Amino acid sequence: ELRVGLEESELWLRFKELTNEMIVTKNGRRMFPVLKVNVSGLDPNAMYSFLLDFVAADNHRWKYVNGEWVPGGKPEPQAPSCVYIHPDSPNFGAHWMKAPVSFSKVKLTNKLNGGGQIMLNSLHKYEPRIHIVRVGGPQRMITSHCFPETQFIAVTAYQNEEITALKIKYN
Ligand SMILES: CCC(=O)Nc1nc(C)cs1
């Protein structure tokens, strides 16, 4: 059985208990914390690609109102985000299982852009999600996994200074 675990959940949970925020920019900003995933149970000899996308956790616009994030009352449907390919892809199971799979090079943007960068909507809440795609073999297979601990709101600047302080403390 394929097992997927979040590395450094301790730390992600401190961010989550404050409501996490991630900066987006026109050129694209790397994430802190970085999503790092522990994977066991792959076929060491099989070929896999690791994909990352961001699910819109709800259909609302969020605003920081007197020190608290509060959703709007005008939901719209959220078009799915684009998919980031881990740059190690494609690779052997052995490769993926020998150390945490670290998405350190994904950049989050607010503007339709060349590529690589993943466009999010500012002030929407997102739940990171990976797809593990068995490639090249006879049977294509996909295993997906969400990381609730890693939820955040996309922001053009930090609103909650407690988030600002944690980001600096741990970076
Ligand atoms: C799952 C398919 C896959 O790995 N796609 C890739 N495309 C590029 C360009 C690198 S890996």
Side-chain angles (χ1 to χ4, degrees), residues 1-2 4-171:
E1 226 105 311
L2 184 26
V4 178
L6 178 62
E7 179 80 354
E8 307 175 31
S9 55
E10 136 81 2
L11 181 53
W12 280 106
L13 267 24
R14 311 252 293 272
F15 281 92
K16 183 148 174 194
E17 74 196 351
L18 306 174
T19 309
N20 198 357
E21 307 181 27
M22 292 287 173
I23 309 278
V24 301
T25 68
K26 174 155 160 287
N27 261 49
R29 182 67 63 83
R30 279 129 91 189
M31 293 181 64
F32 187 79
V34 174
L35 182 68
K36 303 175 186 199
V37 310
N38 295 309
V39 178
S40 61
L42 295 179
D43 179 327
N45 293 307
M47 307 254 35
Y48 302 89
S49 297
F50 276 58
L51 270 51
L52 168 64
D53 62 13
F54 300 83
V55 179
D58 60 62
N59 291 152
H60 297 249
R61 154 167 297 275
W62 289 77
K63 21 157 198 148
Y64 192 71
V65 164
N66 294 298
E68 85 159 8
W69 284 104
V70 291
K74 217 46 145 71
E76 304 166 26
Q78 307 289 327
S81 100
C82 282
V83 66
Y84 174 81
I85 308 158
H86 196 280
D88 292 15
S89 319
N91 228 315
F92 291 107
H95 174 85
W96 297 119
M97 291 190 286
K98 67 172 199 241
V101 182
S102 171
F103 291 87
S104 64
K105 303 304 200 178
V106 65
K107 300 163 106 156
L108 305 185
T109 181
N110 52 180
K111 305 273 197 180
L112 31 276
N113 286 328
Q117 297 111 122
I118 300 306
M119 187 179 85
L120 301 181
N121 295 321
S122 196
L123 297 196
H124 291 63
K125 181 174 281 193
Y126 290 97
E127 189 169 82
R129 180 179 75 175
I130 63 163
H131 311 286
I132 301 168
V133 186
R134 190 170 174 172
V135 296
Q139 72 217 300
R140 179 143 277 181
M141 189 46 191
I142 297 162
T143 77
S144 298
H145 202 274
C146 292
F147 295 96
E149 322 106 302
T150 72
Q151 282 191 4
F152 63 84
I153 301 171
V155 300
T156 57
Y158 298 128
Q159 303 301 303
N160 177 5
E161 82 193 29
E162 294 164 314
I163 290 290
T164 313
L166 251 208
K167 297 261 180 168
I168 291 164
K169 193 166 184 287
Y170 288 106
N171 78 190

